[PDB]
Symmetry: C3
Subunit: 136 residues, 3 copies
Amino acid sequence: AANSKVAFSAVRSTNHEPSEMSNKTRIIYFDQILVNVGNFFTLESVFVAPRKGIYSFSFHVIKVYQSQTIQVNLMLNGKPVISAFAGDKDVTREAATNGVLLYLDKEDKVYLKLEKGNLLGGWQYSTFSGFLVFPL
Amino acid sequence: AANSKVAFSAVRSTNHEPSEMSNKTRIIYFDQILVNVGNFFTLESVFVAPRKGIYSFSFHVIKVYQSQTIQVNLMLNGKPVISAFAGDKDVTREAATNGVLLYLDKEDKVYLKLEKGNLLGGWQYSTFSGFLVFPL
Amino acid sequence: AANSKVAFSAVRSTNHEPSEMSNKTRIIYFDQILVNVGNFFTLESVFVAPRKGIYSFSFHVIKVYQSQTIQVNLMLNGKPVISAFAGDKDVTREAATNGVLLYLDKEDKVYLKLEKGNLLGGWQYSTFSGFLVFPL
Ligand SMILES: *[C@@H]1O[C@H](CO)[C@@H](O)[C@H](O)[C@H]1NC(C)=O
Ligand SMILES: *[C@@H]1O[C@H](CO)[C@@H](O)[C@H](O)[C@H]1NC(C)=O
Ligand SMILES: *[C@@H]1O[C@H](CO)[C@@H](O)[C@H](O)[C@H]1NC(C)=O
């Protein structure tokens, strides 16, 4: 727990339907916390950068069945930064997955929003993780 | 080769059918070692954590043709931790890919098991990699 | 900007057709630079290792529509090291994604080449990122 050590990792462990709040914010959440060094990943959904630096993020959102399609956005402070897609009607399961490095200021917020579609059948096995590569 | 420096990366370089041992253990292996700092990735398949800390892992298992479906599990000490899927009959090639951070104790073992399906046509171009993000 | 701190991340921000030069080299490029600490990622396409060490790389190339198929190769000094595929005619959007750790000498060049297919409809939302895990 030095301040150079910041990481989190989370999974959706069940096929439960989305909560009301997730339903309105459209923000995807992950209930099983595998890693949360620094406790800067809060509300099962959003990471708050503790300091200025480069941060790695990666996500893998699985649609149990066709949705029809979903578009997942990686959000930084209310603006979409990266996008991923899961599309075909016949194909299940399909995953909207992507990853990236980001320059973050202290208090910056990174999280996943669902732009299109919904996680109706649950999004079990979906993953969200990130860490501080180095401070700046 | 300081003890803070631990990483491995591996690929399946051919389309050869699985070995007998892999056939019985159902544990996926990777013959071409790109990186293995610390030599803690052994038997082409399993990583043994040298010390307590946070470790990144990612995998990308490719089914050459429909299997029909495969489910790949990321294993920690005999228990499944993360899962990925490659499904459709018509779609080739499809990949079961996922990744995660894990809190590991010294001597913890992380590896890939094939829960469903088999790698009959070979799993060429498949990748397995991981590293120590920081010690704890 | 210490010499242990090396990272880059890039996105294709539009659906514009490939440039003439990209057309001839078959080398994929990314116009929106999210991160480029050390400025060792140049020409929107190729990373030049500043020092000996282990480097993480990951890519996610999206074909807007069927191509028919694309094969993307991760190149190190003119030789393919890792491969990824996006295949089916009916499926859009599909992604050729993969990642890996590599042992790199100073001046080594890592970049993405398009072995099969073409990025005709654009490759918007595609990502290419990498960083120095540790020096050796
Ligand atoms: C949430 O919004 C969806 C549309 O995405 C709607 O169909 C559903 O009924 C709403 N409520 C809940 C609890 O899911
Ligand atoms: C291994 O097990 C599979 C079932 O997954 C079986 O069909 C095959 O014949 C077995 N032996 C070998 C060498 O693959
Ligand atoms: C580039 O090469 C492709 C084949 O991949 C060709 O069809 C196209 O006309 C060429 N020129 C441009 C500007 O894309």
